[PDB]
Amino acid sequence: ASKLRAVLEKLKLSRDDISTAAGMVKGVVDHLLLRLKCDSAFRGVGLLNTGSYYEHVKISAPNEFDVMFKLEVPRIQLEEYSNTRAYYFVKFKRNPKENPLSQFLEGEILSASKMLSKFRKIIKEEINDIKDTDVIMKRKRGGSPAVTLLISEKISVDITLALESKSSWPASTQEGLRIQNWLSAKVRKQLRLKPFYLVPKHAKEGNGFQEETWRLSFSHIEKEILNNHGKSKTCCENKEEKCCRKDCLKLMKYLLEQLKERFKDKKHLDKFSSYHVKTAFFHVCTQNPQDSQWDRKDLGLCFDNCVTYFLQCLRTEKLENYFIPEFNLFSSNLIDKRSKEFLTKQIEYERNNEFPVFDE
Numbered sequence: 508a509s510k511l512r513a514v515l516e517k518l519k520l521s522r523d524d525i526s527t528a529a530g531m532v533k534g535v536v537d538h539l540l541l542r543l544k545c546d547s548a549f550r551g552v553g554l555l556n557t558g559s560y561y562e563h564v565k566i567s568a569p570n571e572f573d574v575m576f577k578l579e580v581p582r583i584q585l586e587e588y589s590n591t592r593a594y595y596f597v598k599f600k601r602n603p604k605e606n607p608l609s610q611f612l613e614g615e616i617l618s619a620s621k622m623l624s625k626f627r628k629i630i631k632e633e634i635n636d637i638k639d640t641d642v643i644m645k646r647k648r649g650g651s652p653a654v655t656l657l658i659s660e661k662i663s664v665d666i667t668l669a670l671e672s673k674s675s676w677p678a679s680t681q682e683g684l685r686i687q688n689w690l691s692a693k694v695r696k697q698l699r700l701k702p703f704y705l706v707p708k709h710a711k712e713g714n715g716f717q718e719e720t721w722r723l724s725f726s727h728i729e730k731e732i733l734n735n736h737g738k739s740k741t742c743c744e745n746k747e748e749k750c751c752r753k754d755c756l757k758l759m760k761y762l763l764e765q766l767k768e769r770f771k772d773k774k775h776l777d778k779f780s781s782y783h784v785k786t787a788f789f790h791v792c793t794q795n796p797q798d799s800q801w802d803r804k805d806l807g808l809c810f811d812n813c814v815t816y817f818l819q820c821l822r823t824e825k826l827e828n829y830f831i832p833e834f835n836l837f838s839s840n841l842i843d844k845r846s847k848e849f850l851t852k853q854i855e856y857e858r859n860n861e862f863p864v865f866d867e
């Protein structure tokens with residue numbers, strides 16, 4: 508409680524660094540968006556700001572920004588890859604209409620690897636052309652849909668191409684977004700009328716990846732929820748309604764970042780990401796729908812609720828994607844049992860000793 512508030516103080520972002528970093532990111536992004544708009548296929552490219560910075564849960568420093576370069580793909584037809592629920596082949600519906608993505612077709616399917624390749628190429632060539640800022644592209648990460656840029660050796664910007672569909676969400680999402688008792692049935696209905704995105708993250712296929720597959724992304728919905736997260740419409744807008752939901756997410760993120768850092772002899776914890784903790788945190792919100800279950804005075808207890816649910820996810824090897832219930836982020840296919848048992852032991856130790864990892 509006293510300890511957790513002291514940790515939260517240290518995790519706060521500098522107003523000075525937010526102001527500079529935001530301008531540096533704007534300059535790079537605005538410029539890249541302007542170049543992609545010239546290309547016939549990337550004509551309708553649009554910016555969506557996503558991830559922890561724009562959700563106000565980024566911790567320690569504003570040094571990693573996530574952005575979606577969304578592109579409306581009309582008359583899209585999806586084909587679920589090997590019952591994965593989250594990965595799809597992208598096809599096109601019937602009509603003699605001109606297709607701006609004919610270029611990247613590998614038969615009747617829109618290639619994710621080929622479209623990401625060109626997207627990355629246009630960014631690579633533009634980043635080393637016009638100056639006033641020094642921007643370097645980091646090595647392509649296998650599978651990952653992100654094209655990572657580093658601005659003046661300090662701030663990372665993950666840019667993902669995102670196919671935008673204004674059609675009803677895929678059938679795999681029908682039982683997801685279980686926010687009815689928390690944010691309301693009206694809000695769930697309104698959110699599901701919004702577009703959904705496909706990013707070029709490929710499905711794990713043994714040792715490699717199925718390079719034509721795209722994955723569902725709901726980053727825009729996650730942001731909306733985190734920035735309008737209470738049962739009360741006035742949650743965190745006044746001094747009487749200051750909940751500890753975001754503080755609990757920041758503490759879970761820091762717990763995982765700190766354990767990953769200290770066990771930097773690597774491999775054990777490499778597969779665990781902040782998205783696992785974000786997903787587990789949304790499930791704890793569904794489980795504790797009342798703002799009275801996130802009182803600032805109960806910070807210790809609420810954080811423990813988050814820690815025990817995450818420990819349950821690890822032990823049960825179950826962590827459902829919050830939007831795609833049958834997509835298990837903690838399946839043995841994705842994370843071996845050994846790694847989950849290893850993380851369980853470290854989190855149990857931390858929980859039993861009042862989190863020495865948070866000591867200064």
Ligand SMILES: Nc1ncnc2c1ncn2[C@@H]1O[C@H](COP(=O)(O)OP(=O)(O)OP(=O)(O)O)[C@@H](O)[C@H]1O
Nearest residue numbers: 557558559560565566571573724725726729781782
């Ligand atoms: N495995 C995944 N499945 C689905 N969406 C994901 C996944 N990983 C990342 N994302 C989406 O991409 C966004 C940006 O990813 P990223 O790894 O930067 O995390 P973050 O939420 O921004 O937190 P932080 O950058 O502080 O660790 C996430 O907020 C989430 O919306």
Ligand SMILES: CC(=O)c1ccc(NC(=O)/C(C#N)=C(\O)c2cnoc2C)cc1
Nearest residue numbers: 557573574575651665666667706724726
């Ligand atoms: C290594 C690995 O397994 C892995 C899995 C998922 C991702 N990332 C996204 O799935 C993802 C989205 N969607 C994004 O990163 C977004 C979203 N909005 O901006 C950005 C950038 C990255 C890596």
Ligand SMILES: [Mg+2]
Nearest residue numbers: 558559571573
């Ligand atoms: Mg991020």
Ligand SMILES: [Mg+2]
Nearest residue numbers: 558572573665
């Ligand atoms: Mg990122």
Ligand SMILES: [Zn+2]
Nearest residue numbers: 737742743750
């Ligand atoms: Zn609140």
